[PDB]
Amino acid sequence: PRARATQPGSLGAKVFRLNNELPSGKTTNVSFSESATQKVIEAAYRQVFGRMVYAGQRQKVAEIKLENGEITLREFIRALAKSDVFRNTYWSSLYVTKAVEYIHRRLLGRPTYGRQEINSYFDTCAKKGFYALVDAIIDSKEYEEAF
Amino acid sequence: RMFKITACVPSQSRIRTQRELQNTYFTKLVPYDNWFREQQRIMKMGGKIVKVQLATGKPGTNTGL
Amino acid sequence: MQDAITSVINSADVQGKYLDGSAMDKLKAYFTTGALRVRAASTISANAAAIVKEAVAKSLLYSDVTRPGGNMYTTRRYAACIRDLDYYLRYATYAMLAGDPSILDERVLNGLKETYNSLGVPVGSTVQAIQAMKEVTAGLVGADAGREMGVYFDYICSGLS
Amino acid sequence: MQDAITSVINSADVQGKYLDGSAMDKLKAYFTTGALRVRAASTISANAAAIVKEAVAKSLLYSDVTRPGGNMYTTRRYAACIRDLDYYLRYATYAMLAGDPSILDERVLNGLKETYNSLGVPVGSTVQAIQAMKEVTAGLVGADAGREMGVYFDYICSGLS
Amino acid sequence: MQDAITSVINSADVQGKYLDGSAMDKLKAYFTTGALRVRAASTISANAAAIVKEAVAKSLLYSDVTRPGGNMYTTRRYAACIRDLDYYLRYATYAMLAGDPSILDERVLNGLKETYNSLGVPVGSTVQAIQAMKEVTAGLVGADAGREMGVYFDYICSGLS
Amino acid sequence: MQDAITSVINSADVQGKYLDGSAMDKLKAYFTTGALRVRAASTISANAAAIVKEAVAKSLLYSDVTRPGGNMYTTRRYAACIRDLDYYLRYATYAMLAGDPSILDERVLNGLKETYNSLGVPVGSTVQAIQAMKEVTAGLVGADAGREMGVYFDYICSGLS
Amino acid sequence: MQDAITSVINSADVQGKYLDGSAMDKLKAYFTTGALRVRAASTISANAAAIVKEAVAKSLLYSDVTRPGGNMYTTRRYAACIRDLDYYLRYATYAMLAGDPSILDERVLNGLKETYNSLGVPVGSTVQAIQAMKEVTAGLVGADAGREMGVYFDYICSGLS
Amino acid sequence: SIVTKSIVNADAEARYLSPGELDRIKAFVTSGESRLRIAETLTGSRERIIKSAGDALFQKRPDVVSPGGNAYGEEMTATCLRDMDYYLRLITYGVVAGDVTPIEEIGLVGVREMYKSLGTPVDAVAQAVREMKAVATGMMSGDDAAEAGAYFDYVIGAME
Amino acid sequence: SIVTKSIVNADAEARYLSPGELDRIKAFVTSGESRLRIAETLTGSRERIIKSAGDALFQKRPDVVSPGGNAYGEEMTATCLRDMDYYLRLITYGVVAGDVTPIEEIGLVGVREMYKSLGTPVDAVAQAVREMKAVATGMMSGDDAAEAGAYFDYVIGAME
Amino acid sequence: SIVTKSIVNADAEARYLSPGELDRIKAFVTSGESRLRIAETLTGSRERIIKSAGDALFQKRPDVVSPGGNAYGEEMTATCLRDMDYYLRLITYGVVAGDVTPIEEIGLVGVREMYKSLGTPVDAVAQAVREMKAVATGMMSGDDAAEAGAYFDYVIGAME
Amino acid sequence: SIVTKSIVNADAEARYLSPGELDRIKAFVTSGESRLRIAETLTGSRERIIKSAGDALFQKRPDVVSPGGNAYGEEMTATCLRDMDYYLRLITYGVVAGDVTPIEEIGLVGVREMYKSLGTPVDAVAQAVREMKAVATGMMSGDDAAEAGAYFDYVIGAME
Numbered sequence A: 001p002r003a004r005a006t007q008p009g010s011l012g013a014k015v016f017r018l019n020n021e022l023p024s025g026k027t028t029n030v031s032f033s034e035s036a037t038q039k040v041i042e043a044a045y046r047q048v049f050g051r052m053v054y055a056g057q058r059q060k061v062a063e064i065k066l067e068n069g070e071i072t073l074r075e076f077i078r079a080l081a082k083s084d085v086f087r088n089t090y091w092s093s094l095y096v097t098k099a100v101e102y103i104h105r106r107l108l109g110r111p112t113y114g115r116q117e118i119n120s121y122f123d124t125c126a127k128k129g130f131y132a133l134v135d136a137i138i139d140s141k142e143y144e145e146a147f
Numbered sequence B: 001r002m003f004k005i006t007a008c009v010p011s012q013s014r015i016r017t018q019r020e021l022q023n024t025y026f027t028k029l030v031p032y033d034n035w036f037r038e039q040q041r042i043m044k045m046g047g048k049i050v051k052v053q054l055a056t057g058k059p060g061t062n063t064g065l
Numbered sequence C, D, E, F, G: 001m002q003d004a005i006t007s008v009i010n011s012a013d014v015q016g017k018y019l020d021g022s023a024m025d026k027l028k029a030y031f032t033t034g035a036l037r038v039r040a041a042s043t044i045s046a047n048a049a050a051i052v053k054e055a056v057a058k059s060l061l062y063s064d065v066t067r068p069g070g071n072m073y074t075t076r077r078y079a080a081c082i083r084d085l086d087y088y089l090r091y092a093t094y095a096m097l098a099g100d101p102s103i104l105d106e107r108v109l110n111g112l113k114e115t116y117n118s119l120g121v122p123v124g125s126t127v128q129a130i131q132a133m134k135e136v137t138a139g140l141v142g143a144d145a146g147r148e149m150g151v152y153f154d155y156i157c158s159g160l161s
Numbered sequence H, I, J, K: 001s002i003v004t005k006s007i008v009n010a011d012a013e014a015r016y017l018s019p020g021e022l023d024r025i026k027a028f029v030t031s032g033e034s035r036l037r038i039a040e041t042l043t044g045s046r047e048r049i050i051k052s053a054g055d056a057l058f059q060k061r062p063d064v065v066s067p068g069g070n071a072y073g074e075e076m077t078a079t080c081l082r083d084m085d086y087y088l089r090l091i092t093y094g095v096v097a098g099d100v101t102p103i104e105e106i107g108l109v110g111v112r113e114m115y116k117s118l119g120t121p122v123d124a125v126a127q128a129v130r131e132m133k134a135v136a137t138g139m140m141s142g143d144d145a146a147e148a149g150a151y152f153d154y155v156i157g158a159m160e
C-alpha cells in the first residue's frame, strides 16, 4: 500500500504526467511545451470519455484554463467528468449502480472492491447527486495517493 | 466565487524520480465549494499556504454568488 | 505534527544528544497529564454538539451577525459558521491530546487569516465565540483540563488575531 | 525547449525571413561542437554518481550543513540534497547537448528560487556545490567541454542567485 | 502484446533453452522483412482517412445501412462507424509492424463480438467494410505488403465473425 | 445453425435482392472447398479417440490437474474431461463441414463459460487441451485442412476465453 | 467478518433472544482459548518469512514448477508466489485469532478460485504448499495451537480445491 | 509517538478516535514508566554498548577496517562509531516514543541513497546495529530486552 | 524490445509512430546483425564464462561458499552456477531484443523478494554478474564489449 | 527432575517432604503443560535451529572450519552439527524435567575432559550453544523464551 | 612513435619505406586527434583513477599493506601511488605515441630486476595496472577504451 503511487513499467499502461507546467511568456514558435501539453490533454480526454470526443463536444474552456496554468490536472479531469457530454453518455443512459461502477472504473482506474464502498458512493449519489459522486471519487485518498 | 491561491508543499516521505517543481510550488484557482476540502488536503499533507484571495465575485453576495 | 514526546525527541535530536534525565522529566509530566487528557477528550467528544450550540447561543445569536446585515445571516453562512466552530473545537481537542499547539499552527492557522480577510469574516465575533466555547468546555470537563483547553483556544485566538 | 537549431529557426521565423548564410554558419558551428558534445555527454552519463559524490565530498561534507544544525542534517534532507545535485547535473548535460540554456530556464529555474526561499535552503552552499561539480566534470571530460558545462552550470547559479 | 522477436524469446525462454538456429532463422526473416514493414506503415499513415472513406464508399454507402432503419443511419452512428474503421486500420498497421497478431486479440478482438452483439451492430457488414479496407490498402502498398496487411485484416475478420 | 450457403441466402434475403455475382462467387468458393471438407471430416471421424487421447497425452497428463487437488483428478472428472474434448472435436468437425461457425456459438459456446465458471473448471487448461487437439488433427489431415479445422478450434478457444 | 463473540451475538440477535446459558458457555470456551490464541499469534508473527520459505523448501522447490514451463518459473512469478503464501499465513493467523473462518471466505476465498483458474495457477500445488505451511507452523507452535491453526489452513485448502 | 499516528489514522479515515485506540493511548500512558526505565538504562551505558558492538563488528566483518575499505583510519573508525551513536540515539527516541516513526523521520528515509553516495556498505551497518541489539538486549532484563529488540529489529529490517 | 516499446509508447498516446521512433526502429533493424554476432559470442562460450566467473566470484566472496553461507556444498554451488547461467541467458536475450524488457520482464522484477525468501545476499549476486561482465567483455572487441556491458550494467544496476 | 531432587534432599535429611517442597512439586506439576508446549516448540523446529545456529557459529568463529580447526571437512562439520543436535536434545529434556539434572547428568559432567581429548575448543562450543539460544529464543513468546533460555544459560555456564 | 619504428625497420632491411607503412604513418597522422582526446581525458582524471585503483588494489591484495609487506606505512603507500602515477604517465605517453616503445624505454626494461632489489611483488604491480586499466576504460567511450586498453594490456603483459 506504499506502492500505490509506483507506476508499472512495460507490464501495464503508460502514465501521463503534466510535469513540465507549460510555462511561457513570450513563447518561441517552435516551443516544444504546448505540444506536450496537447498530448496530456489528449490523454485526459481519452481516459475520461474512453475515446476522443467529437469535435463540437470537447471543452475548450477547461483546456484553455489548463494551458494557462490556473487549474491542476486533477481539477481539469473533474471539469471533464462533470461535463454534460460525460453525464449524457455514461450517467444518464445507464442504471445508477452500473453508472457508479463505470464512473469508478473510469476515474479511479479500477473496479470497486466491495459493498461498503458502493453503499458510500451511491449514498453520495442519493442525497446529493452525480456531481457529488464525481466530487467524492476525485476526493478519495486512493486518487490522491495513486495520481 | 473562486480563490486564487499559491502555496509551497514539500514531499512527505519518499525520494522522487520526477522533477515536481510544479508539485511543490502550486499556484492555482480553487472554486469556493471545494475550497474547504482542498485546504484540508493541503494541511493533511503538511505544506503551508502562502496566499489566499478570491479574485471572483465580491465577499458579501447573498444572491447570485 | 508533534506531540510532547515528539517535540522532546526533536529538541534532543537537533542538538544531537541522547535522552537526558530532564527529557524523562518532561515525558513523565506529559504522561501524568495525559491520563486526565484522555478522560477530558472523551467528555468533549461526547458533548461536542451541545458545546457548540451553547457557544453560539452565548455570543453570536442575538447580535447583528445572526441577524440580517451580518456575515452569519443566510443559512449557507450559518452552516459555514457552525462548521468553523466545530473545527475549532475538534482541533483544540487534538492539541489537548497531543500536548502541543503545533497542530493548530500547522492545520488551523495556516491560511485561515487571509481567507478570513478575503471573505470579510469578522475576527472579533469569532474570537468571542471561541472564548465562550472555552468556558463552556471548562464548565463541562473540569478545572485543570479547562485550563488545558484554555491555552489551546487562546493559541487559536492569538493566531487568528 | 529549443536547440541551437530551433533557436536559429525561431529567430529567422520571428522576423519572417528564410534561412540566410549566417544561419547556416551558426548551424555548422553547432554541428562541429556537437560531435564532442556527444562524447562528453556519454562520459558524463557514465560517471554521474562519482561526479556527484566528489562534488559533495569537496564542498558540503565537513561543514555545518552535513553536520547537525544545517539543512543537510537528516537522511531525508541528505537524500533530497543528492537528488537536487543529480538533477542539476542531468539538466546541465541536457543544456550541453542542446547548445541552449533555455531548458535550464524552462524546467530548472522556473520556481526553484521561491521554494528554496520557502524551505530555507541555503543558496550559497548549493552554488558552491554546483561549482565544485563544475570543475569535477571539467577535470573528467576535458577542457572545451569543461567550458561548455561551465557556462551552463553558471547559468544555473545565476538563475539561482 | 509481443512482436515476432518477443514471441521467439518467449518460446526459447519457456523452453529454458538458448537461441538455437531455428530462432536465429526466424529473427533473420523478421529482420529482412522489417524495412518493407516500415515503408508500408509510413504509406498507410499517409492515407488513413482516404483508405477509410474509400472503404465506406465501396461497401457501406448507398446501401440499406445508411438509409433509415440501418445501424449506420444517424450522424452519431456514422461518426462512430468511421471511428471503428479507423481503429481497425490503425491496429492492423500495428500488427503489421510487430509481425504478430497478439495486439489484435489483446486489444481489438477481446470484447468486440459481445460489444457489437449488445449494441446491435451488424457483424457481416463491418466484416465487408474491413475487407474493402484491405482491398484498398493492398491496392495502395502493393502485392506483398498488401498480403502481409491482409493476413491481419483476415485475422480481425475471423475474430469478429 | 446455418452453413455458408444458408448464410449467403440469408444475406441476399435480408437484402431482398436476388443472388448477384458476389454471392455466386462465394458459393463457388464453398463448392470448390467442399470435397476437401468431406475428406477431412471422414479422416477426423476415423480417429476421434486417438486425437482426444493424444491431446490429453500432450497437455493434461502428468501435470497438476491429474494429480490430487486438480479438477481432472477423479475418474468421474477424467471421463467428463474426455467427454468435453470429444464434444469440442465433434463440433469443430461440424463447423468445418458447414463452413460457418454458427453452430459453435449456438450449441457449444452458449452457456459454456458460465458452466465452467460455476463448476470450477480451469478455462486455460482446457484451452491448451483444445489447442493440442488442433495441433494433432492438423498433423493428421494436412496443411490446409488443418488450417480450416484450426480456424474453428480458435473460434472455440476465443469464445471460451 | 466476525469472531466467535460476534457470531454468538448475531445468533442470539437473529433469534431476538437474550444470551442464554449455551451462549455463555461458548463465550467461556473462547475466553479460555484466547490466551493460547494470542501466544500462537505472536509466535507466528515472529517467523513469517521462515515458515513461508520452509514451506517452499518442502513442497515447491526442485520440482517442475520452478523449472522452465512451470507457473512458478520467473522471478516475478516466484515473488508473487511468496506473496500469495504470506497472504495465506497472515489470514490463517487472523482466523485463528478471531476463532471464526468468516474472514477467510470473505477476503481470501471470495474470488480466489476464479482468479487462479484465469491465471493458470495450479491449485493442487498451492494446496500442497499451504499443507506444508500448516505442517511447519504446527511444528512451530505445538500440538493444540497447531491444530487450531490447521483447521483454518484446511478451510483455505477446502475452499481453494 | 503513538498519538500522532492514531491521529493521522483517524484523520485519513475522517472519523474520531475509536475507543480501541483510545485504550491504546491509555495503555501507552500507563506503560510510560517502563519505557522511561529502558531508555534510562540505554542512555546510561551507551559507551560500553558502542565499544563492545564496534569491536564485535570489526571482528565479524573486517572488510570495512581493511585498506581500501570504507572505515579505514582513525577518523573513519571514529565516524563509524559516531554513526552507531546516532542510531542508538534514534533507538532510544523510538523506545521512548512508543513508535518507530521518529527513527523513520530522522534516520531511515534515504540511508541507502546517502550510503551509496559515501560508499558505505549498508549491510555492514545492519551488522553493526545487529551487534548493538545483541549487546543491549544482553544488558537488559528479558521483557525490556524484548521491547528494545523490537525497535532494534525494525532498524535492521529497514536496513537490509 | 524496441518495437514493443515504441508501439506501446505511441499506443498510450493515441497516435501513430512518430518518424523519429520509426528511424529508431530502422537503426535497430540495421544493427541487428551486430546484435546477433554479440549473441553468438555470448552463447558459444558460456561454459568458460560461467566457470571463470564462478571462480572469480568465490575468490572474491569466499563467505558464501564457506559453511554458513548460502552456496555451501556440492548441489548448492551447482545451483549457484545455474543461477549465473540463467542471468547470462537473460543477458543474451536482452542483447538480441535491443532493450532490457526481456531481462527485466523475466528475471529482475521480484528478484529482491525471491533472494530474500531464499536467504541470499544480493550483493554477492551483483558480484557474480560483475565477474560475468569482466569475463564477457574480456572476450570481445571494443564496441561489442560496450554493447554487451550495457546490459550487464543494467543487471548489476537492477540488483542494487 | 524436581521430584527426584526434592525426594533426595528430604532423603538425606531422614525426613519426609516439607510442605514447601510439596507446593514446589505442585507448582511444577501445574506448569508442566507450558513445559510441554516449549518442548514441542523446540522439537518441531530442530532443523532450522541447528542449521541457522551452525551458520551463525561458522560466521562468528571461522577458524574451526578453516583448515587447521577441528570441524574442517564434510564429515567433521556433520559431526559438529550432530554435537549441536545432541545439546538441543538435552535442552529439550531439561525443559521437560523442570531441572538441569538430565542435562548435567548426561552431557555436562566430563565435557571438558572429552572435548580436550578430542582437541576441541570449548569456547567455540559455548558460542554454538549461544547461537542455538539466539535462534530458539527468537522462535518463542517472552516467558517461553525466558524459560528455555534458563536451560540454554545453564549449558553455556557449564561450558565455562 | 610509429615513425621511428618504421624507420628502424626500413633501416635494418636496408630499403626505403614501403607504401604500406607510408599509409600507416598517414593513417596515424589522421588519427592524431583521437589519440589527443584519449590522452586529454586521461591527463584530466589521473587523481580519481589513481585513488579508485589504489583502493581497489588494496581491497583485492592486502598483503602489500599488511605489516611485514612492502607498502606498509604512509610514505610507502604514497610511493606505491607514485609508481602508479609513473605508469599511468607512461600509458599516456604510449597512447599519444601510437606505439608502446616509450613505455618500453622508460619503464619496462629492468622492472623485474629493480623490483627484485626493492622487494616489491611484481604481480601486485600487475594487479595495480589492471585496476587502473579497468577504471580508465570505465571512464572512456568504448572505442577509445579499447585503444587505451591495448596499451594497458601491453603493460600488464610485460609485467607478468
Ligand SMILES: CCC1=C(C)/C(=C/C2=NC(=C\c3[nH]c(/C=C4\NC(=O)[C@H](C)[C@H]4CC)c(C)c3CCC(=O)O)/C(CCC(=O)O)=C2C)NC1=O
Pocket: B010, B011, B018, B019, B020, B021, B022, B024, D065, D071, D072, D076, D077, D078, D080, D081, D082, D084, D085, D087, D088, D091, D107, D108, D109, D112, D115, D119, D121, D122, D123, D125, D126, D129
Ligand atoms: C528539475 C529541476 C528541479 C529541482 C532542482 C527541484 C528541487 C527541489 N528540491 C527540494 C528540496 C531540497 N533541496 C535541498 C538542497 C540542498 N541541500 C543543501 O542543503 C544544499 C544547499 C543543497 C544540496 C546541493 C534540501 C536540503 C531539500 C529538502 C529540504 C526539506 O524540505 O526538508 C524540493 C522539495 C521536495 C523535496 O524534498 O525534494 C524540490 C521540488 N525540483 C525540480 O523540479
Ligand SMILES: CCC1=C(C)/C(=C/C2=NC(=C\c3[nH]c(/C=C4\NC(=O)[C@H](C)[C@H]4CC)c(C)c3CCC(=O)O)/C(CCC(=O)O)=C2C)NC1=O
Pocket: C061, C062, C063, C065, C066, C067, C068, C073, C074, C075
Ligand atoms: C432567510 C433565511 C433565514 C432563516 C431560516 C433564519 C432563521 C433563524 N431562526 C432563528 C431563531 C428561532 N427560530 C425559531 C423558530 C421555530 N421554532 C419553533 O418553535 C417554530 C416551530 C419555528 C418557527 C417556524 C425559534 C424558537 C428561534 C429562537 C431559538 C432560540 O432562541 O433558541 C435565528 C436566531 C435569531 C436571529 O439572529 O435573528 C435565525 C438566524 N434566519 C435567516 O436569515
Ligand SMILES: CCC1=C(C)/C(=C/C2=NC(=C\c3[nH]c(/C=C4\NC(=O)[C@H](C)[C@H]4CC)c(C)c3CCC(=O)O)/C(CCC(=O)O)=C2C)NC1=O
Pocket: B032, B035, B036, B039, B040, C065, C071, C072, C076, C077, C078, C080, C081, C082, C084, C085, C087, C088, C091, C107, C108, C109, C112, C115, C119, C121, C122, C123, C125, C126, C129
Ligand atoms: C481545519 C482548519 C480550517 C478552518 C477553521 C477553515 C475555515 C473556513 N471557513 C470558511 C467560511 C466561513 N467561516 C465563517 C465564520 C463565522 N461566522 C461568523 O460570522 C463568525 C465570525 C464565525 C462563526 C464562529 C463564515 C460566516 C464563513 C462563510 C462566509 C462565506 O464565504 O459566505 C471557509 C470558506 C469555505 C466555506 O464556506 O466553508 C473556510 C475554508 N478551513 C479550515 O481548513
Ligand SMILES: CCC1=C(C)/C(=C/C2=NC(=C\c3[nH]c(/C=C4\NC(=O)[C@H](C)[C@H]4CC)c(C)c3CCC(=O)O)/C(CCC(=O)O)=C2C)NC1=O
Pocket: A051, E065, E070, E071, E072, E076, E077, E078, E080, E081, E082, E084, E085, E087, E088, E107, E108, E109, E112, E115, E119, E121, E122, E125, E126, E129
Ligand atoms: C480499439 C478496439 C475497439 C473497437 C473496434 C471498439 C468499437 C465500439 N464501437 C462502438 C459503436 C459503433 N460501431 C459502429 C460501427 C458499425 N456499425 C455499422 O453499421 C457498420 C457495419 C459498422 C462500422 C463499419 C456504430 C454505428 C456504432 C454506434 C452504435 C450506437 O451509437 O448505437 C462502441 C460503442 C461505444 C461508443 O461508440 O463510443 C464501441 C466500444 N471499441 C474498441 O475499444
Ligand SMILES: CCC1=C(C)/C(=C/C2=NC(=C\c3[nH]c(/C=C4\NC(=O)[C@H](C)[C@H]4CC)c(C)c3CCC(=O)O)/C(CCC(=O)O)=C2C)NC1=O
Pocket: D061, D062, D066, D067, D068, D073, D074, D075, H064, H065, H070, H071, H072, H076, H077, H079, H080, H081, H083, H084, H086, H087, H090, H106, H107, H111, H118, H120, H121, H124, H125, H128
Ligand atoms: C541520525 C541519522 C543519521 C545518519 C545515519 C548519519 C550518517 C553520516 N555518516 C557519516 C560518515 C561515515 N559513516 C561511516 C560509517 C560506516 N562505514 C563503515 O566502515 C562502517 C561499517 C559504517 C559504520 C556503521 C564512515 C566510514 C563515514 C565517513 C565517510 C567518509 O568520510 O568518507 C556522515 C558524515 C559526517 C558528518 O556530517 O557527521 C553522516 C552525516 N547522519 C545522521 O544524522
Ligand SMILES: CCC1=C(C)/C(=C/C2=NC(=C\c3[nH]c(/C=C4\NC(=O)[C@H](C)[C@H]4CC)c(C)c3CCC(=O)O)/C(CCC(=O)O)=C2C)NC1=O
Pocket: G061, G062, G063, G066, G067, G073, G074, G075, G078, I064, I069, I070, I071, I072, I076, I077, I079, I080, I081, I083, I084, I086, I087, I090, I106, I107, I118, I120, I121, I124, I125, I128
Ligand atoms: C531467470 C530468472 C531466475 C532466477 C535468478 C532464479 C533463481 C532461483 N535460485 C534458486 C536457488 C539458489 N540460487 C543460489 C545462488 C546464489 N547464492 C549465492 O551465494 C551466490 C551469490 C548466488 C549465485 C552466484 C543458491 C545458493 C540457491 C539455493 C538456495 C537454497 O537452496 O536455499 C531457486 C530455487 C530452486 C530452483 O528451483 O532453482 C530459484 C527459482 N530462478 C529464475 O527463474
Ligand SMILES: CCC1=C(C)/C(=C/C2=NC(=C\c3[nH]c(/C=C4\NC(=O)[C@H](C)[C@H]4CC)c(C)c3CCC(=O)O)/C(CCC(=O)O)=C2C)NC1=O
Pocket: J064, J069, J070, J071, J072, J076, J077, J079, J080, J081, J083, J084, J086, J087, J090, J106, J107, J118, J120, J121, J124, J125, J128
Ligand atoms: C549428549 C552428550 C554428548 C556429546 C556432546 C558428545 C560428543 C562427541 N563429539 C564427538 C566429535 C566431535 N564433535 C565436534 C564438534 C565441534 N567441534 C567444533 O569445532 C565445534 C565448535 C563443535 C560443534 C559445534 C567435532 C569436530 C568432532 C570430531 C572430532 C574428531 O573427529 O577428532 C565424539 C566422537 C565421535 C562420536 O562418536 O560422535 C563424541 C562422543 N557425545 C555425547 O554423548
Ligand SMILES: CCC1=C(C)/C(=C/C2=NC(=C\c3[nH]c(/C=C4\NC(=O)[C@H](C)[C@H]4CC)c(C)c3CCC(=O)O)/C(CCC(=O)O)=C2C)NC1=O
Pocket: K064, K065, K070, K071, K072, K076, K077, K079, K080, K081, K083, K084, K086, K087, K090, K106, K107, K111, K118, K120, K121, K124, K125, K128
Ligand atoms: C617510469 C618508470 C619508473 C618506475 C616503475 C619507478 C619505480 C620506483 N619505485 C620506487 C619505490 C616504491 N614503489 C613501491 C610500490 C609498490 N610496492 C607496493 O606495495 C605496491 C604493490 C607497489 C605499487 C604498485 C614501494 C612500496 C616503494 C618504496 C620501496 C622502499 O622504499 O623500500 C622508487 C624509489 C623512490 C624514487 O626514487 O622515486 C622508484 C624509482 N621509477 C620509475 O621512474
